[PDB]
Structure 1
């Protein structure tokens, strides 16, 4: 604001006007100095308002640029995350048996549920009671979905281990049911 050309002209105009008033000449110089300071303050209002607009305009633009950069950064990061998860998921599936059954299918279309139902190598039974235990997965091997599995670890609800001996009709209450028992295809 102070650096505007009107600033110095206005300041020295008011100064010399006060000087001439201390000289006490005829009022025509009073009218002249009034006119001078008037136009000076007019253009001063002009430039002051211009700078006031410029501040807000520049700040809006700058915060806008910050927002744009932020959006682009997050976007690139999320795309990388998605691609990574996709590829690390893919590189897991048992490609052999899957290739087998799909290429066996007459079109390349197979309903989804049978995909795990016939190519999974695991089985996470969940049991809510000793009775359904007795009647689904007794002993060390069992049969389900037309294939032969075998137990390998029986973790209870507290994420502890439970030796296959502990699960007995009289040893029901001490085991915090349900009983997440895994397995393995065989």
Structure 2
């Protein structure tokens, strides 16, 4: 309807403006969201604040996680837990190229903001 056409135009313009801003942190969270790596809470800005993010696949995991460090929104996050689609814990050693087919994706990462 008319409301939907206006909304579509406004949302399209929003993303065009964001792209033109060309800020590293905004680009990072938008590109991640395009791949299905999305936050589950408001991304916080202070040390040790909590962040939960969906990690949809092994490629996203490897591009965002190194050891216990998650890199996202131009910041570092200390991974606390990784849980599967069945809410069951996943040990980091299980998240490998060869073993990932056996995990219940998507995973949810819970982390705390570093420095």
TM-score normalised by the shorter chain: which range applies? 0.5 to 0.7
1:137 aligns with 2:56: no
Q: Once superposed, what is the RMSD of the aligned Cα atoms?
A: 11.4
1:74 and 2:2 equivalent?
yes
Q: Structure 2: which 5+ residue stretches go unaligned?
A: none
Say which structure is richer in strand: 2
Does structure 2 retain, via aligned residues, the 8 Å contact 1:98–1:119? no
Distance 2:34 2:57 in 1: 42
TM-score by length of 2: 0.55
Deviations 1:91-148 (A, max 9, x none): 9999999999999999999999988456881111211110111112232113333332
Q: Is the 8 A contact 2:47 2:112 kept in 1?
A: no
Q: 1:91 to 1:121 in 2, by over 3 A?
A: farther
With over 3 angstroms needed to count, the CA separation of the structure-2 counterparts of 1:93 and 1:108, relative to structure 1, is: farther
Greater relative CO, 1 or 2 (CA 8 Å, sep 6+): 2
Change (3 A) 1:120 1:77: farther
Larger radius of gyration: 1
TM, length-normalised to structure 1: 0.36
Aligned length: 114
SS at match of 2:50: coil
Structure 1: 5+ residue stretches without partners: 1-72
Q: Give the helix-richer structure, 1 or 2.
A: 1
Residue 56 of structure 2 contacts residue 107 of structure 2 at CA under 8 Å; is this kept in 1? yes
Distance 1:168 1:94, change over 3 A: closer
**Cα shift readout 1:3-53 (whole Å, capped 9, x = no counterpart):** xxxxxxxxxxxxxxxxxxxxxxxxxxxxxxxxxxxxxxxxxxxxxxxxxxx
8 Å Cα contact 2:82-2:109 kept in structure 1: yes
